[PDB]
Write a protein that binds this ligand. Structure first.
Ligand SMILES: CC(C)C(NC(=O)[C@H](C)NC(=O)OCc1ccccc1)C(=O)N[C@@H](Cc1ccccc1)[C@@H](O)[C@H](O)[C@H](Cc1ccccc1)NC(=O)[C@@H](NC(=O)[C@H](C)NC(=O)OCc1ccccc1)C(C)C
Ligand SMILES: O=C(O)c1ccc2c(CN3CCOCC3)c[nH]c2c1
Lengths: 99, 99
C-alpha cells in the first residue's frame, strides 16, 4: 500500500500465531515490541531515544508477517507504549518513504 | 524522492535560513530539533520517547523546507540527540510510506 501520515501508521502484524498491531517507524533502527512472548533465551541490549537509554531483551531470527509480507530478523522486547517495526524489518518488506 | 531504509532517512532541511540535517521519522507525532533560536514566542512543552520525557520549547507556524518542499507548522526545540521531522510536517510535504 501507499500510507499517508495524518494518523499513526499502524498496521496489523502476525507473530507466533498472534495478531497484533504495530507502527511502521522509519526513525527506529530496530524493531521493538512491548510484551509479546517470544520463545526461550534473550540477550541483553541497550537502546536509546529522546529520554535517554533503556535495557531491552534481544531475540534473533523472529518471523513477523507485516501486511502479508514475511520478514525474519532481530526483535527487541522493551518498554514501548506501542509495538514498533523498525528499518531492520521495513527494508525486508520493501518499504520506502516517498514525496 | 524515493528513499530506502537500509540506512537512516536523513535529509537536508532549511529552517531560519540554516541548512541542517534531520531524520524523516514516521513514528514521531511531532517534530523535534536541536536548540536553535527561532522567531516568535515559544511555549513550554514536554514530550515522551524511549528512556522517558524531555522539556522542549514549542514554536508555532515555523517555515521549514524539506528537499525543497515548503512546510509550515509546529517545531519543538530542545536537547534531542537528533533532529526529527515527524508526521505533522511529513504530511505537509506529501510524504508517504510504500511497500
Ligand atoms: C524505538 C527506538 C529503538 C528508537 N531508537 C533508535 O532507533 C536508536 C537511535 N537506535 C539504537 O538505540 O541503536 C542501538 C545503539 C546502542 C546505544 C547507543 C547508540 C545506538 C527511537 O527512540 N526512535 C524515535 C526517534 C528517535 C531517533 C534517534 C534518537 C532519539 C529519537 C522514533 O522513531 C520512535 O517513533 C519513538 C517511539 C516511541 C514513542 C513513544 C514513547 C517510546 C518510544 N518516538 C518518540 O521518541 C517521540 N514520541 C512521539 O512522537 C509522541 C509525543 N510521544 C508519545 O506518544 O509518548 C507516549 C508515552 C511516553 C512515555 C511512556 C508512555 C507513553 C518523539 C521523537 C517526538
Ligand atoms: O526552556 C525552558 O526554560 C523550559 C522550562 C520549562 C519547561 C517545561 C515544564 N513543563 C511543561 C509541561 O508540563 C510539565 C512540565 C516544559 N518545557 C520547558 C522548557
Amino acid at each position: 500500500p501507499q500510507i499517508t501520515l495524518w494518523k499513526r501508521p499502524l498496521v496489523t502484524i502476525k507473530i507466533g500465531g498472534q495478531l497484533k498491531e504495530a507502527l511502521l517507524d522509519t526513525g527506529a533502527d530496530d524493531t521493538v515490541l512491548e510484551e509479546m512472548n517470544l520463545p526461550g533465551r534473550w540477550k541483553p541490549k541497550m537502546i536509546g531515544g529522546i529520554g535517554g537509554f533503556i535495557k531491552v531483551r534481544q531475540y534473533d531470527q523472529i518471523l513477523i508477517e507485516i501486511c502479508g509480507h514475511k520478514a525474519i530478523g532481530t526483535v527487541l522486547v522493551g518498554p514501548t507504549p506501542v509495538n514498533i517495526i523498525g528499518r531492520n524489518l521495513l527494508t525486508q518488506i520493501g518499504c520506502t518513504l516517498n514525496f
